[model samples]
Target: SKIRIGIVGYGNLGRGVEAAIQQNPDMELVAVFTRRDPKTVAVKSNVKVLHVDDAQSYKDEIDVMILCGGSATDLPEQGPYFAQYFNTIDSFDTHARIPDYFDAVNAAAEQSGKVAIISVGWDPGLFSLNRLLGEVVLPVGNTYTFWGKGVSQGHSDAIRRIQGVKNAVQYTIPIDEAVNRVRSGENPELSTREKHARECFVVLEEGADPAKVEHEIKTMPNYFDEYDTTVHFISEEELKQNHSGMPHGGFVIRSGKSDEGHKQIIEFSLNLESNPMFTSSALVAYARAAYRLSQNGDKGAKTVFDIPFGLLSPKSPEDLRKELLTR
Candidate 1:
């Protein structure tokens, strides 16, 4: 039987996925839910668009739920309802949430015998491949800087988002600022303490070791060899007070000068869920991937980083040659 699919969070990526599901021939687009009625998300299909809450009633009818939108905070509560029967293709909000989101789905899937694939897009998704894509022959040690709002006082502290790591607090100084401070000499105007006031801190997850995280975060690329940094963890309380209680966008800007006197820059701003076809196609590919995984009786949550080909092309050992090599 064709897999029955329900789409939650029908925004740009939402509608894009609806089309993907609608046209797959092997899958069925049962319905769609969004917070708002949607300002006409590529309206062509006759798919029922309903309040996001309505998905609960239709849960049993769906064999798979492709989550292209919605709050990561909400998923731990709302997701299990859908996964009791339907497998999940979750486009969770952050790398921090990926681990927990997997567990959240796993608890239900283990009982219901469904599966989930998470963090299925760019940045943490495909961009994670940047390290594997090539060998970096940098001119040597890199410098990067940025100023943005919602900037988590400590990004790594959000490490609690990791499944095992918890109660983390982190602080960081731009590597560029640190390198320049040492080279051009200290800022004569500031207090000696404020000048070097802490760089990073994190409360490690329960039972997870600090050495584990340190080995991961501390291993900078060869480009950072010339750079020095600062970081620390607290006796506990005051570190929590340092955060701004605002919902900040995770915007990042990175720059580096190439060896041949050419300077290059790459920037990614993941806010304002704009852009339809792109995030949609990216997600639908995984939705199809999950379908195949479920068909194969695979259970539990998995990340794109750990999946083969498309999660979309996982079992297809046939067409890979022409698809990847030449044709």
Candidate 2:
């Protein structure tokens, strides 16, 4: 049976998932539920477009619901709410507050006897697995993860929400000097500002004060204040021409000692042309695993760590053994 997917929120990530669903033969997109009016929402295919208010009524029709909401607020509430009706997957990337979200979804999904996969994007998703695998193999190690010289979706979303901002894109540029020191086994202590500088390109509304917009962005707590941030006000057309694509990538490096003081290093990285596309790929792959797990009676919330690698692939066990395994 094909996995019936209901994508919530029709932003970049939502459209990305729809594209991914088309590419996966094992799954089909049943509908798109958005906060926007149903008639206003545009879709690429024949799938139904519905209001988010009507999601629960169509619950049985959707086997899995991929949530494409902002991490700042949306997914924290939506993930749990949708879990009550169907298996759910999300890319909630709020690094510091995952535990609280996890606990809430854990209880909700458990109560509903559904499986929910939270925070399944690359950084907290794939990089997370790399971090764990490295530590398990080499117990005495320091893991350093550096993000971007590319656009940060969450940060950009945060900036766009501020008053007077018409549109925005935030780039997280990693300090090469700090990155090199970590890679070279120096293990130097680096602050957030020392590792990366934020560069924001924003388009302001008519009559909006640039000073007020800049102040709000630079002075914002938790998201921007801890780092050195610069805001550039540009016209909307300039933003579309120059800074349109959602590109993001980063590295996970684990350095450790092995075999009587021998230095060892394991690294994993991704360079994505489209951040939302890659994240959508991760969500789609994990959706397969989430579906299988729920069918097998595994309920409650799971992260990327809980998924088995084979479950993410469409190939049969025999094909995987023959093609991927070493003789």
Candidate 3:
């Protein structure tokens, strides 16, 4: 039987999940739930598009719900709410609030005997796994994560929520010099401002105060305050034509020494042409794990760290060994 998946939230991420599900024969998309008017959203398939309010009624039909909500707000509430009825997977990338978010979803899913996988994207998802693997193997090492030089969906979401802002996109461009230093094993002491700069392209509603919008974005805590942020006001058409694509990538580099004092450096990098597509693919992968875990009676919320590597794949153990094993 195909693993049934439902998507909550429609945007670049939602469309990506739809495409991702089509790419995998073992999984199927049930429907997409959106906060926006269903008629306003266009999807690739003939799949049902319903208001988010209708999700609970269709819960049993879905084996897993892949949340495409923004980390700043939506997932914090949606992750727990949806977990009460279905196994869930999400890309909640607010690094500072993950523990609290995890606990809330944990309590909800456990009480309902469901499985929920949170923070299942590149940075907190794939990067998180690599960070753990690198640390466990090299306890004496330092791990550094450099993001973007690309669009940040979460940060863009934050800006949109602020008063007087219409639509916006934020780009996190990494400092080349800083990235080169880390790649060279300098282990340089770098501040947040030194490593990356956030650039925001905003579309303001008519009569909205531009200065106020810019002030709010620049000083926004946890999102932009720590970095050098430049806000540019632009026409909606310009934003659509030039900044439409959500492309993002980064690197996770670990540098240390082995027991024999030999230098060991593990570098994992992502150069994503479409951040949403890659992020959605990651959630779809974890949705497979979430389904398997729930079927095996595992309850509560799990992060990328808790999922076993093999569960994310479709192949049998023997096939995995035959196809991927180097030995």
Residue-wise C-alpha lDDT for candidate 3, range 1-327, written one tens digit per residue: 999999999877888999999888999988999999999988889799999999999977999999998778899999999999999999888768988999999999999999999999887889988999889988987898898879877789999998788899999998999988887777788999999999999999889989999999999999999999999999999999999887889999898888888778899999989988998999899999999999899999998888888899998878988988867
Write the residue-wise lDDT of candidate 2 on 1-327 in tens digits.
899999999988898999898789999999999998999988988699999999999888989999999888889889889998889999998878899999989999999999999999887899999999989998997888888889977789899998889999999988899888888877678888899999999999888999999999999998899999999999899999999888889988888887698888888988989989999988999999999898899999999888889988889878999999886
Strongest candidate by TM-score: 2
Please report the TM-score between candidate 1 and the true structure.
0.52
**Candidate 1 structure lDDT:** 0.56
Q: Which candidate do you rate higher for TM-score, 1 or 2?
A: 2
Candidate 1 wrong stretches, greater than 4 Å: 1-3, 19-26, 34-44, 50-61, 132-276, 314-316
Q: In order, what lDDT does every prediction score?
A: 0.56, 0.90, 0.91
What TM-score would every model get versus the actual structure?
A: 0.52, 0.90, 0.88
C-alpha RMSD of each candidate structure in angstroms: 13.3, 2.4, 2.8
Instruction: Compute the lDDT of residue 192 as modeled in candidate 2.
Output: 88
Q: After superposition, how far is residue 3 of candidate 1 from its true place, in Å?
A: 4.4
Over the full model, what C-alpha lDDT does candidate 3 score relative to the true structure? Answer: 0.91
